[PDB]
Write a protein that binds this DNA or RNA. Structure first.
Length: 145
DNA sequence: TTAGTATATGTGCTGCCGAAGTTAGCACGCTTTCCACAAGATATATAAAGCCAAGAAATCGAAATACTTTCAAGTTA
């Protein structure tokens, strides 16, 4: 059952937040073929709950960041669809204008998202000393460059 | 040492399309923040009338019966 295969893969991803490899998936479920496992992984990547990483050991399939929530009001869709580039920037930070241009969302919407994230302690706003024009948003856990 | 060969040497050729310059005589006619200074938002008479929305009473509109008229067919003659 492909639904059961996807559920088991999601459970394995939950158990291993750092990601799982095809070897681990096969060791956990050896009675299923590599073709079925690949079809399940493709369906998961198409529906958008897993992300692929290329490490020196091979391929890793990690559950998308959804448990860490700072903006639950409305929908987690925009929350994660902003946190993606927020994390991508991370140490270097990113201005509000750049966040708006990358999200293609209204200024009011992005401001609400940022305010909710700051209220739930997921992002920190720091004044850019190089160009004191706007405040860049970074991850609360990362050290400011 | 000398004839054959490769190179650059400036030169001189070709097109290359474009460059300046031309075309004659009158009368009409937005964003971030950041910033600082002063302006909401506040009690309080206070007389005054006009306004804008619940209730209570009133009367208009008219509908379902009660009178009179009217036929029309039938009676005492």
């Amino acid at each position: 059952d492909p639904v059961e295969i996807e559920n088991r893969i999601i459970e394995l991803c939950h158990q291993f937040p750092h990601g799982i490899t095809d070897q681990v998936i096969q060791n956990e479920m050896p009675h299923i073929e590599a073709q079925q496992r690949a079809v399940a992984i493709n369906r998961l990547l198409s529906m958008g709950q897993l992300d692929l990483l290329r490490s020196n050991t091979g391929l890793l399939y990690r559950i998308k960041d959804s448990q860490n929530a700072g903006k639950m009001k409305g929908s987690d869709n925009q929350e994660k669809l902003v946190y993606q580039i927020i994390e991508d920037a991370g140490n270097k930070g990113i201005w509000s204008r750049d966040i708006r241009y990358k999200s293609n969302l209204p200024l009011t919407e992005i401001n609400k998202i940022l305010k909710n994230l700051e209220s739930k302690k997921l992002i920190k706003a720091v004044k850019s000393v190089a160009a004191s024009k706007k405040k860049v948003y970074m991850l609360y856990n990362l050290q400011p460059d």
